[PDB]
């Protein structure tokens, strides 16, 4: 498709799709709490839909009506035995988190997914749960789906040190410690997603936290809450970058996620000298109104500790760095394939074909000077982030024409991306 080129102004008010991690936890916490839980602006994906059906098979009343999710709480020990095997689908979050939720369940369950889910090991979650007294086993020694679980009413508290930097393993143990009798400590290897810690304080739970060390008492009773799911910063960052980049522009984003472990993009904009406004902060759900206008940017250093907070935002950061005056260096980033990378190279090949300098590195990339972008042919290769990055880069092109092949991949996380951009140009 031929993308929109030569844009004079960008104005309007946008509300981005909800966060995936919070959308998953809203169903889990809503079911385990006592009373009614109402979820607003949930992420309407198949992975969140899988978790909703899993709890529905366990006996939890969940109503999906007109974009509003109404959950009737059963209690901390109110889940019932399902009629058949639980389908988790493609969600790695669903299979891992609920495994810790069913730790205090006095019945046998079966958890399965698709081919993509069945290839992923679950041994990192079964090891600590076995020490608590839960009988779990899968295929081979690395415990591949499907898994067979049998919990216990006499759950033991856990003192575990996590060998891997995973939030899904960390959250699974927290849901299990919420049912266990006594004091349980969970130690992180590195600072990761803390959405479970935020939602626990929301539903009436209690924790201490001692710099990586998470102490949780049990058993705990929770109360149903009014949940407004914060917008995904990953989806919002595409508009935050475009607002600073497009001439004579100002964009407002209502209630965008503001969690510390995912706000790496804000730290970049602030350092570059971008006019980013933060208003209307929601402290209980971690969300704030983000306003951005046209600004002159400067080159900054993005390295250690900052990387895990912006690892998903790397493609558009390079586009933001492309219009910045000076040199911006990204280092300490090699995880595009465990210790390889192809994401940076695709970002490079797509952007330097449009405008000036981008040089790939073994641990990141180097971007240099303000570039005047022109028309080029770009293929996404099944990536949603590349397509959205090229779409907002096309607005700067005044001469040539930007053609995007495989533009259907954008609908993976942002179905109304082109509909939102259309309202901003004419706004």
Swiss-Prot record:
Pathway connected to this protein: Metabolic intermediate biosynthesis; chorismate biosynthesis; chorismate from D-erythrose 4-phosphate and phosphoenolpyruvate: step 6/7
SUPFAM superfamilies referenced in this protein's UniProt entry, alphabetically: EPT/RTPC-like (SSF55205)
Gene Ontology terms for molecular function: 3-phosphoshikimate 1-carboxyvinyltransferase activity
GO annotation, biological process: amino acid biosynthetic process; aromatic amino acid family biosynthetic process; chorismate biosynthetic process
Binding site for phosphoenolpyruvate: 20, 92, 120, 168, 343, 385
CDD domains listed in its UniProt record: EPT-like
InterPro entries (UniProt xref): Enolpyruvate_Tfrase_dom (IPR001986), Enolpyruvate_Tfrase_sf (IPR036968), EPSP_synthase (IPR006264), EPSP_synthase_CS (IPR023193), RNA3'P_cycl/enolpyr_Trfase_a/b (IPR013792)
Catalytic residues (positions): 312
Enzyme Commission designation: 2.5.1.19
Cellular-component GO terms for this entry: cytoplasm
Activity regulation (UniProt): Competitively inhibited by glyphosate. Activated by ammonium, rubidium or potassium ions.
Compartments, as annotated in UniProt: Cytoplasm
Keywords noted in UniProt: Amino-acid biosynthesis, Aromatic amino acid biosynthesis, Cytoplasm, Transferase
Catalytic activity: 3-phosphoshikimate + phosphoenolpyruvate = 5-O-(1-carboxyvinyl)-3-phosphoshikimate + phosphate
Enzyme type, top EC level: transferase
Keyword Glycoprotein carried by entry: no
Record: residues binding 3-phosphoshikimate: 21, 25, 166-168, 312, 339
Source superkingdom: Bacteria
Assembly notes: Homotetramer.
Family classification: Belongs to the EPSP synthase family.
Function: Catalyzes the transfer of the enolpyruvyl moiety of phosphoenolpyruvate (PEP) to the 5-hydroxyl of shikimate-3-phosphate (S3P) to produce enolpyruvyl shikimate-3-phosphate and inorganic phosphate.
The name this protein goes by in its record: 3-phosphoshikimate 1-carboxyvinyltransferase
Annotated source species: Streptococcus pneumoniae serotype 4 (strain ATCC BAA-334 / TIGR4)
